[PDB]
From a paper:
The exocyst is an octamer formed by the proteins Sec3, Sec5, Sec6, Sec8, Sec10, Sec15, [name], and Exo84 (3), which assemble in a holocomplex to control the spatiotemporal regulation of exocytosis, orchestrate cargo delivery, and mediate vesicle secretion. One such effector, [name], interacts with two rice [name] subunits, OsExo70F2 and OsExo70F3, suggesting that the pathogen may target exocyst-mediated trafficking as a virulence-associated mechanism. Here, we reveal the structural basis of how an effector from the blast pathogen ([name]) binds a specific host target (rice [name]) and how this underpins immune recognition.
Using this sample, we obtained protein crystals that diffracted X-rays to 2.7 Å resolution at the Diamond Light Source (Oxford, United Kingdom). In the crystal structure, [name] and OsExo70F2 form a 1:1 complex. OsExo70F2 adopts an elongated rod-like shape formed by the stacking of four domains (domains A to D), with 16 α-helices in total (annotated α1 to α16) arranged in four-helix bundles. Following placement of OsExo70F2, we identified an electron density consistent with the sequence of [name] and were able to build residues 44 to 70 of the effector (residues 20 to 43 were not observed in the electron density). A structural similarity search performed with PDBeFold revealed the [name] structure is most similar to LIM domain zinc fingers with a motif of C-X2-C-X12-H-X-C; however, it lacks a second zinc binding motif commonly found in this class of domains. We refer to the [name] fold as ZiF and note that this three-dimensional structure has not been previously reported to our knowledge for other plant pathogen effectors and is distinct from the MAX fold found for other M. oryzae effectors whose structures are known. [name] locates to an amphipathic surface formed at the junction of OsExo70F2 domains B and C, with residues from helices α8, α9, and α10 contributing to the effector binding interface. The most striking feature of the OsExo70F2/[name] interface is a hydrophobic pocket formed by OsExo70F2 residues Phe416, Leu420, Met437, Tyr440, and Val441, which accommodates [name] Phe65 and, to a lesser extent, Tyr64.
Residue numbers in the entry:
A (entry chain B): 44 to 70
B (entry chain A): 85 to 129, 157 to 175, 217 to 230, 257 to 329, 332 to 460, 483 to 571, 599 to 647, 660 to 683
The structure:
């Protein structure tokens, strides 16, 4: 039940913005 | 005579005694200072070299037509010419590129810079490289051929150029070692495609085999940008496969990922020839197909994030139509083919039929092969009005399909056995559906 439209499997990273998601580095 | 050398020696020492003034700003004067320099060369076959003069006047001639130039050198050889000539060339070309907007960024500076700025620095660089290839390298060949009367000329063009090449190859390396970020794909390709030109242009302008070393560097630089493009596109596919959000799209609207991914793939196709050469239907064809599979596979699981199976369909329809529209309204449709597009239409056709069955079957049960179906209808209208079918044509046809089933069925049921809604009330309430807003009726 995530709260952002984008959510990374590997790292925690989530965002409602695709550009921000697709250029995120896995932390 | 030796007196014709004395007079020649005289005016040289007179001119040597005033380095303030340049010889090439006086009509009758510049004519005389050559005749003296010729007799020096004649006599040998005091140093009276006056090359320190001619070497500085050539410097002060190339820096602020090119006729005084090609006479300074015929008298200069009869080495220090080359080293000087090449220097000023190297300097003036350094300044052209600075003006163009070519920085020499460090690895730390590159890694720290915000994309919006790095974007504009890459944009500037591509423009710079286009200029270097299409204007400068040709211009520097024309100058050497006209100025220098040896074939030395091969050495001079290359030494005049190296500095200019090295300075663009620097920023080539800057982007080559930059962290892989889908943002940058289009720009790296712009840089790759621009830099590729250098070799052809250099192959056409270099007679000898000393231009091979510079061509070697440019190749190694291209090949690294080649690596940077494969890695970037990989990172896109990697980050797409990793995406696992379980937040349901409200109103069953098109997912932002669908917009971003399809915009991205539509832009790749503008680089088919390069991408086909670097990846190993077309190699891009195969990749475009894989990446869109991942998008669909992701969206299918997002369609299961609903209690309502009807909204699952509306969502799958809206998103699968958007995908097909962007494919058909671009060169994407051409690459992955009709059979691909026909199938997706098939799936969209079935998704709509799934909706009409799922949502409108209990409502058509409340009339038989007292009965309060008002709660069924009110509940559908309640929240299916707040739903969205963005495409006007699809939205229109879902409503026409709904009405044509429900309306005549209600005219019969009421018209026979009869007390809240008239058939017109339902027709009007049906027209409020999928408008992404709560309908006026209640
Ligand atoms: Zn991550």
């Amino acid at each position: 039940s995530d709260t952002t439209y984008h959510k990374c499997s590997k790292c925690g990273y989530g965002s409602d913005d695709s550009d921000a998601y697709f250029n995120h580095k896995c932390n | 005579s030796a007196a014709a050398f004395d007079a020649a020696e005289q005016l040289i020492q007179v001119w040597d005694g005033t380095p303030e003034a340049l010889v090439f700003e006086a009509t009758e004067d510049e004519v005389a200072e050559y005749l003296s320099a010729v007799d020096v060369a004649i006599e040998h076959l005091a140093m009276a070299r006056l090359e320190e003069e001619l070497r500085h006047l050539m410097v002060r001639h190339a820096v602020p037509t090119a006729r005084g130039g090609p006479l300074v050198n015929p008298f200069e050889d009869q080495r220090e010419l080359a080293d000087a000539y090449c220097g000023i060339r190297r300097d003036l070309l350094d300044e052209y590129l600075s003006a163009l907007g070519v920085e020499r960024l460090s690895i730390d500076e590159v890694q720290r810079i915000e994309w919006k700025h790095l974007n504009d620095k890459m944009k500037k660089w591509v423009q710079a490289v286009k200029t270097v290839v299409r204007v400068l390298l040709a211009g520097e060949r024309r100058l050497c051929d006209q100025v220098l009367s040896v074939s030395l000329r091969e050495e001079c063009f290359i030494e005049s150029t190296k500095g200019c090449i090295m300075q663009i190859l620097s920023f080539g390396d800057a982007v080559a070692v930059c962290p892989r970020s889908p943002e940058k794909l289009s720009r790296i390709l712009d840089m790759y495609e621009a830099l590729a030109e250098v070799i052809p242009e250099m192959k056409d302008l270099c007679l000898g085999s000393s231009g091979d070393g510079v061509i070697s560097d440019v190749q190694a630089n291209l090949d690294r940008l080649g690596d940077a493009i494969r890695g970037t596109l990989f990172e896109f596919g990697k980050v797409l496969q990793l995406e696992s959000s379980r937040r349901a799209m409200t109103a069953g609207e098109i997912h932002p990922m669908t917009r971003y991914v399809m915009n991205y793939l539509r832009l790749l196709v503008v680089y088919s020839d390069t991408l086909d050469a670097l990846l190993d239907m077309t190699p891009l064809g195969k990749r475009l197909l894989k990446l869109i599979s991942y998008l669909e596979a992701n969206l299918e699981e997002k369609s299961k994030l609903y209690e309502d199976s009807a909204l699952e369909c509306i969502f799958s329809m809206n998103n699968l139509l958007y995908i097909v529209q962007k494919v058909r309204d671009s060169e994407l449709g051409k690459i992955l083919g009709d059979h691909w597009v026909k199938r997706r239409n098939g799936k969209i056709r079935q998704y709509s039929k799934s909706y009409l069955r799922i949502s409108w079957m209990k409502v058509l049960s409340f009339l038989k092969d007292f009965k309060n179906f008002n709660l069924a209808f009110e509940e559908i209208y309640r929240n299916q009005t707040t739903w969205k079918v963005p495409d006007p044509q699809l939205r229109e046809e879902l409503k026409i399909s709904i009405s044509e089933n429900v309306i005549p069925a209600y005219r019969a049921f009421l018209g026979r056995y009869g007390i809240k809604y008239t058939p017109e009330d339902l027709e009007s309430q049906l027209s409020d559906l999928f408008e992404g807003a709560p309908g006026p009726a209640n």
